[PDB]
C-alpha cells in the first residue's frame, strides 16, 4: 500500500495472508468471505506471463494476521486449500478482466476477534454504494512505494468516474473493473501495490453498518501515480459466479 | 448473517479512526 | 526475512 497507515488490530479481520510454502513468502492479499472460503484475484494463482500457475498444494492462507513477516503465535490461523476456483472467462491475455478466484480451505477457520468473514454486496447496496467521490478501504502488506511493511497497512480511496478511470490509461476497462484514488488535484494520495494484489475494496454500509467487499484489487500502471488509479475487480459484477461455485461445491 | 460485523469495533460499538471518513463520503 | 511458520503447517 502507497501513502496509507498502519491498520489497528481487529480492523481487517476478514484480511487474508497468501503465502508461498517453499520459498516461504507472500503470494498476495486475499479476503475470508465465510468459514472455508477466501476471495482474491485470479492473477495471484494464475498469470501465464510472469510464469505463474500455481497449485493448491503450493499455498496456505493466513488469517488473522497483523504482522507481514513474524508467525502470530495464538493469533494467526494458517489453512490448507482443497481446491483453487478460477473464473472460467478470467482475461490474462488482455486486460484481467473477471480477476477473481475462490480457495476452499481444507478445513473450517475458527472465527475469533481477529478473523472474521466480510459481506458481499448485494446489488441494492452495490446499486447505492458504487459511486464516483465514495470511499471505500484497501489492506494490504504490499510495497509501500513504485519498501516492505512491518504490519498490515491501510489506505481509504475515493472512487473514481468511470470516464476518468478510461481517460486515465491505455488498456481497455470494463464494466467488471472500477478505479479507485485521488487526483493530483485533490492534494491527498494513497494507492495498493504489487503484493498487495487479491485483498479486499471494503465498504461500511451506512444503511445497516457491516462491511462490504466492493472490490478485489486487480491492477495498476506504477503504484501511486499522479494522474493513474487504481484498478478493481467489482465484485458485485461477478457475485453469480461466486454463489455458483459456492452452491456446487 | 453476522458477516462484516467487526469482533473488536462493531461487535463493541467501538469505530475505527478513521471509518468517519468514508461514512462522511456517503452523500 | 519472513518468520518460520511450524513445520507442522507445512
Ligand atoms: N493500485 C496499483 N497501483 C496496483 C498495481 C499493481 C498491482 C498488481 N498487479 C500487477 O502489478 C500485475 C499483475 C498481472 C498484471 N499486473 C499489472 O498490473 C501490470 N501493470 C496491483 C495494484
Ligand atoms: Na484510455
Ligand atoms: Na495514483
Redesign the interface.
Known amino acids: 500500500i502507497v501513502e496509507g497507515?498502519d491498520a489497528?488490530?481487529?480492523?481487517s479481520?476478514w484480511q487474508v495472508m497468501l503465502?508461498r510454502?517453499?520459498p516461504?513468502?507472500?503470494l498476495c492479499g486475499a479476503s475470508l468471505?465465510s468459514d472455508r472460503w477466501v476471495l482474491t484475484a485470479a492473477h495471484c494463482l494464475l498469470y501465464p506471463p510472469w510464469d505463474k500457475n500455481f497449485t493448491e498444494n503450493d499455498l496456505?492462507v493466513?488469517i488473522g494476521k497483523h504482522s507481514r513477516?513474524?508467525?502470530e503465535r495464538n493469533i494467526e490461523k494458517?489453512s490448507?486449500l482443497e481446491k483453487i476456483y478460477i473464473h472460467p472467462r478470467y482475461n490474462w491475455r488482455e486486460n484481467l478482466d473477471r480477476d477473481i478466484a475462490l480457495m476452499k480451505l481444507k478445513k473450517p477457520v475458527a472465527f475469533?476477534?481477529?478473523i472474521?468473514?466480510?459481506?458481499?454486496p448485494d446489488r441494492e447496496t452495490a446499486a447505492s454504494?458504487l459511486q464516483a467521490?465514495?470511499?471505500?478501504?484497501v489492506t494490504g502488506w504490499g510495497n509501500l512505494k513504485e519498501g516492505?511493511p512491518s504490519v498490515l497497512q491501510?489506505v481509504?480511496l475515493?472512487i473514481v468516474e468511470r470516464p476518468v478511470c478510461k481517460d486515465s490509461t491505455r488498456i481497455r476497462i470494463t464494466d467488471n473493473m472500477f478505479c479507485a484514488g485521488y487526483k493530483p488535484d485533490e492534494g491527498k494520495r494513497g494507492d495498493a501495490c504489487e503484493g498487495d494484489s487479491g485483498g479486499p475494496f471494503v465498504?461500511?454500509?451506512?444503511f445497516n453498518?457491516?462491511?462490504?467487499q466492493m472490490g478485489i484489487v486487480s491492477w495498476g500502471e506504477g503504484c501511486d501515480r499522479d494522474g493513474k488509479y487504481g484498478f478493481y475487480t467489482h465484485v458485485f459484477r461477478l457475485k453469480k459466479w461466486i454463489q455458483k461455485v459456492i452452491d456446487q461445491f | 448473517a453476522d458477516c462484516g460485523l467487526r469482533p473488536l469495533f462493531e461487535k463493541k460499538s467501538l469505530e475505527d479512526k478513521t471509518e468517519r471518513e468514508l461514512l462522511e463520503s456517503y452523500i | 526475512d519472513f518468520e518460520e511458520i511450524p513445520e507442522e503447517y507445512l
Open positions: 497507515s489497528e488490530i481487529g480492523m479481520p503465502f510454502k517453499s516461504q513468502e507472500l468471505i496456505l493466513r513477516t513474524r508467525y494458517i490448507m475469533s476477534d481477529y472474521h468473514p466480510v459481506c458481499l454504494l467521490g465514495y470511499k471505500g478501504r516492505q491501510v481509504n475515493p465498504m461500511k454500509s451506512p453498518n457491516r462491511w462490504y
